[PDB]
Automatic annotation (TrEMBL), chain A:
Protein keywords: Ribonucleoprotein, Ribosomal protein
Name the UniProt record assigns to this protein: 60S ribosomal protein L23, putative
GO MF term (any one): large ribosomal subunit rRNA binding
Family the entry assigns: Belongs to the universal ribosomal protein uL14 family.
Residue runs in coiled coils: none
Superkingdom, taxonomy of origin: Eukaryota
SMART domains for this protein: Ribosomal_L14 (SM01374)
Gene3D superfamilies: Ribosomal protein L14 (2.40.150.20)
Automatic annotation (TrEMBL), chain B:
Name of the molecule in the record: 60S ribosomal protein L40, putative
InterPro entries reported in the protein's UniProt record: Ribosomal_eL40_dom, Ribosomal_eL40_sf, Ribosomal_zn-bd
GO MF terms held by the record: structural constituent of ribosome
GO BP annotation list: translation
SMART domains referenced in this protein's UniProt entry, alphabetically: Ribosomal_L40e
Domain Large ribosomal subunit protein eL40: 1-52
Keywords assigned by UniProt, alphabetized: Cytoplasm, Ribonucleoprotein, Ribosomal protein
UniProt subcellular location: Cytoplasm
Major localization class: cytoplasm
Gene Ontology CC annotations of this record: cytoplasm; ribonucleoprotein complex; ribosome
From TrEMBL, chain C:
Domain (Large ribosomal subunit protein uL6 alpha-beta) ranges: 12-94, 117-183
Name of the protein in its database record: 60S ribosomal protein L9, putative
GO terms classed as biological process: cytoplasmic translation
Taxonomy, superkingdom: Eukaryota
Protein source organism: Entamoeba histolytica (strain ATCC 30459 / HM-1:IMSS / ABRM)
GO terms of molecular function: rRNA binding; structural constituent of ribosome
SUPFAM superfamilies for the chain: Ribosomal protein L6
RNA sequence: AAGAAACAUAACGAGUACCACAAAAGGUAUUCAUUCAUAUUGACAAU
RNA sequence: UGUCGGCUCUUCCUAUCCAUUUCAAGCAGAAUUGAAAAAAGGUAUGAUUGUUCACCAUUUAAUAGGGAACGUGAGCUGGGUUUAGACCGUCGUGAGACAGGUUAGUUUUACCCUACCGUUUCGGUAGAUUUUCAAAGUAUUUAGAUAGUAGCACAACUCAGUA
């Protein structure tokens, strides 16, 4: 579902990392299980940066979302990362929205800003994104 | 859009051959022995299977 | 088993001159000059005259002679005799190989260089890569008609190999070749004259 | 240690018993022998 | 001759899981299946269990199978097993038995030779005499028998919703 390539973003989100769900789909927080497209190495933990599709579970939310595995996209992170034009930037919290494999967003709203890395990769997220930082 | 005349010469280069049941090698029509060494120069051959629409 | 003497000969027509120097036959005829080396350490190639017809007269021949030798080595007398025979044909009535192009849906364009020493195959099965296929010295390609080319030359070993080089560059890969009957095929092999 | 004849050898094939390994099976590969048929005024292959 | 497993690390085998090159299909395409060359490069993260094993949830191009004193304890750990305390169940008259379960139980020494990794010291290679030459010493510039070897893989766009 992703469109185009993504530059290097230093992945600051580990396995078993709890992130907020900025969506409106009754899921409060998600914990990362695996990262789609991650290439394994011995003893390494899966890593996710901005705009990275992940496989996550909801440990806090409505009964129709809790205790189930979902697919999420990382939209912001507290890990400092550098754009190719010499801009060093980082957000205030780690957050993600729930999207499916085709990329179409399940919800219809996003709270707070959205990184340009995630917005350009997934067009459906940018359409629902208030601001793109 | 291929003429039957062009079919005749294209099939012979590709289809009209024998196959060793052990070599799996492509053999001429009148061949009676697996040509390749690994299959032991076997003597059991079958025609190449035709296309069925 | 071992044959005491195996002999073969090739007749020289009027317009062909053959000179032999240590298994190095040079043949010069009306069309041009051809040369080859037959480095078999058990053959004796020499010119002579020999009556080859039951009632016909003597005629100039090249005799390929091999004495005591096993059937593995006795089989090369006729091979070399055939090779010299092809030279005489090549320098008198050269060889031409007519190749016809077959495609299913994508037309294939052949871009022949001005000298005729190179060709270009484009849009083969919709591909974007372009195949060049060089030609051996003495072999010339030309566009006979629509979707057809012929190769002109004197040496049957150079002409046939160049034609096979063109076909070998346009094989269909990872597809059922009993359905994708595409490529350049040799329609027939004949003489220029 | 020189000479003689062969079936081998285009292969890490062969090479001093006990000994330190190899089988069934297959080959229009090769050498020799037996049996049968076609062998000419003309068999086979090709034209 | 320190007797399980795990952790760390190197190397080897191919009876190849992936990537590369090929042939075959009851191979239209896509996805697959059988086989050949090839062992130079890769082959994961976790819940339960001391487990090897197993069985699940993912991720991946693939998450192949094995050896090296069932590789590897003066490399670690001590979870299991396998002393001495104690509990239960069955057996025994009893002391006591139980590849039955449970809990607590000291893991010593390299400064020796070699191997390996790095690092110094001393010694040193034979037939040329055009003095514009030849040889010995010191220093620099080079030389390269030999040994090792490194780049892989995936994704996106276009080809194309085309064959």
């Amino acid at each position: 579902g992703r469109q185009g390539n993504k530059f290097r973003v230093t992945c600051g989100l580990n396995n078993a990392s709890t992130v907020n769900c900025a969506d409106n789909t009754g899921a409060k927080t998600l914990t990362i299980i695996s990262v789609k497209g991650f290439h394994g190495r011995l003893n390494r933990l899966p890593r996710a940066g901005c705009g990275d599709m992940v496989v996550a579970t909801c440990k806090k939310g409505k009964p129709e979302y809790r205790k189930k595995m979902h697919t999420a996209v990382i939209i912001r992170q507290r890990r400092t990362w550098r754009r190719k034009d010499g801009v060093t930037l980082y957000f205030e919290d780690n957050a993600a929205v729930i999207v499916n494999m085709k990329g179409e967003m399940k919800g219809s709203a996003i709270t707070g800003p959205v990184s340009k890395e995630s917005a350009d990769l997934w067009p459906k997220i940018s359409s629902n994104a208030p601001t793109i930082v | 859009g291929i003429e039957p005349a062009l079919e005749a010469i294209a099939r012979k280069y590709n289809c009209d051959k024998m196959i060793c049941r052990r070599c799996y090698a492509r053999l001429p029509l009148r061949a009676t022995t697996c040509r390749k060494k690994k299959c032991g120069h076997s003597g059991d051959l079958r025609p190449k299977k035709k296309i069925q629409s | 088993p071992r044959l005491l003497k195996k002999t073969e000969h090739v007749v020289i027509p009027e317009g062909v001159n053959i000179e032999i120097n240590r298994k190095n036959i040079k043949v010069t005829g009306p069309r041009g000059s051809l040369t080859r080396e037959f480095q078999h350490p058990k053959v004796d190639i020499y010119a002579s005259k020999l009556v080859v017809k039951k009632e016909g007269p003597k005629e100039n021949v090249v005799v390929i002679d091999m004495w005591y030798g096993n059937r593995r080595d006795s089989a090369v007398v006729r091979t070399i005799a055939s090779h010299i025979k092809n030279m005489i044909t090549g320098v008198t009535k050269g060889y031409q190989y007519k190749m016809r192009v077959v495609y299913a849906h994508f037309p294939v364009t052949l871009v022949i260089a001005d000298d005729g020493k190179s060709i270009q195959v484009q849009n083969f099965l919709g591909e974007k890569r372009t195949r060049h296929i060089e030609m051996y010295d003495g072999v010339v390609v030309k566009k006979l008609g629509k979707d057809e080319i012929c190769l002109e030359g004197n040496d049957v070993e150079k002409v046939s190999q160049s034609a096979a080089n063109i076909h070998a560059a346009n094989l269909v890969r990872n597809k059922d070749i009993r359905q994708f009957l595409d490529g350049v095929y040799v329609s027939e092999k004949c003489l220029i004259e």
